[PDB]
Amino acid sequence: PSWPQILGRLTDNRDLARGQAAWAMDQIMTGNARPAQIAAFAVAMTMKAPTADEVGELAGVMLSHAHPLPADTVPDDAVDVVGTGGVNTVNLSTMAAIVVAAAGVPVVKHGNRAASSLSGGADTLEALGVRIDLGPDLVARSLAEVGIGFCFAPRFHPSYRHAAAVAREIGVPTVFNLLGPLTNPARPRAGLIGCAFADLAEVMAGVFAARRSSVLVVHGDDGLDELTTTTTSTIWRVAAGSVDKLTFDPAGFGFARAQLDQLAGGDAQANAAAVRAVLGGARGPVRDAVVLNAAGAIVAHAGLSSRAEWLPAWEEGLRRASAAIDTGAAEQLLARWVRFGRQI
Amino acid sequence: VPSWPQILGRLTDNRDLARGQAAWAMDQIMTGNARPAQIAAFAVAMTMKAPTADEVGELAGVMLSHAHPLPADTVPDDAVDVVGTGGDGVNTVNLSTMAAIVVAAAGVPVVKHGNRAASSGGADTLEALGVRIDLGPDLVARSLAEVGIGFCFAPRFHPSYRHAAAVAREIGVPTVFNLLGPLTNPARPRAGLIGCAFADLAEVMAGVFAARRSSVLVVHGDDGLDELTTTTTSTIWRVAAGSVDKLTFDPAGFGFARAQLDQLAGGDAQANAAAVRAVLGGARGPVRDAVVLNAAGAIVAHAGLSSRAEWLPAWEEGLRRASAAIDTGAAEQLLARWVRFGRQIL
Numbered sequence A: 001p002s003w004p005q006i007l008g009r010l011t012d013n014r015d016l017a018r019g020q021a022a023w024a025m026d027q028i029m030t031g032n033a034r035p036a037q038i039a040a041f042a043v044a045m046t047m048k049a050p051t052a053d054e055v056g057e058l059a060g061v062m063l064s065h066a067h068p069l070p071a072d073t074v075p076d077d078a079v080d081v082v083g084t085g086g087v088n089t090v091n092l093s094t095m096a097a098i099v100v101a102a103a104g105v106p107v108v109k110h111g112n113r114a115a116s117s118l119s120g121g122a123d124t125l126e127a128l129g130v131r132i133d134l135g136p137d138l139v140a141r142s143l144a145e146v147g148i149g150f151c152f153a154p155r156f157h158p159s160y161r162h163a164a165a166v167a168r169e170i171g172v173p174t175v176f177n178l179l180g181p182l183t184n185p186a187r188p189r190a191g192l193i194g195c196a197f198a199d200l201a202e203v204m205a206g207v208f209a210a211r212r213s214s215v216l217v218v219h220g221d222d223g224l225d226e227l228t229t230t231t232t233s234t235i236w237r238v239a240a241g242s243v244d245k246l247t248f249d250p251a252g253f254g255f256a257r258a259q260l261d262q263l264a265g266g267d268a269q270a271n272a273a274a275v276r277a278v279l280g281g282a283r284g285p286v287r288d289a290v291v292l293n294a295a296g297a298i299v300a301h302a303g304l305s306s307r308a309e310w311l312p313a314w315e316e317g318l319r320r321a322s323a324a325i326d327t328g329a330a331e332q333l334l335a336r337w338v339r340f341g342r343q344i
Numbered sequence B: 001v002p003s004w005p006q007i008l009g010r011l012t013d014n015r016d017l018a019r020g021q022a023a024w025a026m027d028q029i030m031t032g033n034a035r036p037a038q039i040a041a042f043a044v045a046m047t048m049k050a051p052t053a054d055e056v057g058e059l060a061g062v063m064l065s066h067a068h069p070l071p072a073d074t075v076p077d078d079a080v081d082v083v084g085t086g087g088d089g090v091n092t093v094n095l096s097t098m099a100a101i102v103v104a105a106a107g108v109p110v111v112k113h114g115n116r117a118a119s120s121g122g123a124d125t126l127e128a129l130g131v132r133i134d135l136g137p138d139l140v141a142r143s144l145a146e147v148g149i150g151f152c153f154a155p156r157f158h159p160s161y162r163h164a165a166a167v168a169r170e171i172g173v174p175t176v177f178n179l180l181g182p183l184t185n186p187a188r189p190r191a192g193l194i195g196c197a198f199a200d201l202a203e204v205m206a207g208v209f210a211a212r213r214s215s216v217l218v219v220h221g222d223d224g225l226d227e228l229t230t231t232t233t234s235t236i237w238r239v240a241a242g243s244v245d246k247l248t249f250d251p252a253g254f255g256f257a258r259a260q261l262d263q264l265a266g267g268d269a270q271a272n273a274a275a276v277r278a279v280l281g282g283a284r285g286p287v288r289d290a291v292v293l294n295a296a297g298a299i300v301a302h303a304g305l306s307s308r309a310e311w312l313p314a315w316e317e318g319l320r321r322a323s324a325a326i327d328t329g330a331a332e333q334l335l336a337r338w339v340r341f342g343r344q345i346l
């Protein structure tokens, strides 16, 4: 394989042969690709439209260079809650993660300080006083003692540094933005995974299907990279190596239609302020979206070893997510997470 | 307002740039302010999007504003270029070098523009023949005036393009940057035979020349050659007086035999030099035929600066003028005069 051959193939709008994405990504991860080559590849792959096989190779090679968590420290039924980027919804996924954990589902998240290739989220967490830059042993302790952990992308994926510098220099989202959810170093087997583009959502669902995974890959039909409350969403429901694609409408559960501007995030501080209000009981469109997506992560979680059917799973998910907020469990778990970070 | 996220986002979404965006990107590239990653991302995105004539005219215009000019009134008004944008992984540099010699020998001033090859080429072959290729503006002008031909060495006239050129080499694949050689000839000839390996990009190039009111034939071999082929038919965009006629072209209607592609190609410096010596020395075959065909196209384009003459008799007179330049010895002699001029510089 070679760069001229792989880039020529992509610029001719052709899918790569098996192994070529892996080769390129391995060159990128070993420091052997020049910044222009990295950029050429990211852009051409994006514009051809990557396939599920191509993205599985990129993600798999990247994972092979990553630091794992210590053996048998990630509970088997841990979940992730994340979007690949819009505008963004770090507000919504951060809050949903905290609520899911407060409902008793172990959560392991993965991200970087924005505007980053592997999703943001770390900034907002820092602004809440959470300690984001912890190493495997302590993320593991966090998970066992608080029920949630955060894997800081720069410490678990040091070899991704060359890709990430290119991603920053070019500014525009590429195929690399799909990698965050697919390269969580804790390897959770369940999750709610949002994406801003329907074709790329389907591609991610194909990657998760080939893993031992119970995941809802979600795309708001307004462009949101989470389940939306402004209209329908499309969901690629992934289990047992298959995909059940469906149109989802939260009006079915009593959610009023909101406006798009009402859901979008802000900076770290605005996001922290919003986390505090929602976890404190403030009702409105943001809470609703948080409850919707948390329930979504819970339904994905139930798919790992529950027999429960879609609608009953959703109804129980909504009840558990709401109760985690209304009982103060979410507020308390966030306080407990902050405490854990300070108590080192 | 322009930024790399804005421009790159627009291109990756398959959208044409807004007016002024391509110019801004090129100015960043030319001043050294673009990161290699931004340069590569731009070249690749623009290529897969499919550039427009407007976008390419902005790129070329900015590049030219950074170039070194030839001195005032040293370039004949009716000078021509003969060049292709790079064969589709197939070497046709030999042809355009020979055609240029033959065109100049027919009395039409020729000013070429290229680099040492695998980076437009042609310079390596000329060096192997004894031509001094790396000369400053005054000496190119004097070459044009005393010999009737000159060569603008790209690294000399376009030094601020080195950032882009390093990126183009690093990625290997052809991009929109490959269209720039013929559109940034520092002598700014107003006529030419310009070959392109891709039909869609040839048509784009013709729009840029049309906008400049150049008299050009942009040519695409229907076998993918960036030159008029004898292997099959060719598409030609006839550009004169700001408008563009697209035509099919069959060399068989002038009596030319069908050749094999493997015949019209050939490798490195010393073998290309030997092929030039043979053709100018009068050897017949497909190489001579392709040379005569392309020289004739340049002569037709040159005529288009004056006349808007009838197509077929323009070509017959061009084919005759090109054949005679060889068979009189005028072409072999012009090459000798060119080599002699270079040796007088010391």
Ligand SMILES: Nc1ccccc1C(=O)O
Residues within 6 Å of the ligand: A112, A116, A117, A118, A153, A154, A155, A157, A158, A159, A160, A161, A164, A165
């Ligand atoms: N996103 C990353 C992943 C790994 C190493 C460095 C980075 C970085 O932010 O530069």
Ligand SMILES: Nc1ccccc1C(=O)O
Residues within 6 Å of the ligand: B115, B119, B154, B155, B156, B158, B159, B160, B161, B162, B165, B166
């Ligand atoms: N092709 C070129 C044109 C101008 C300047 C440098 C180069 C170069 O090869 O580095």
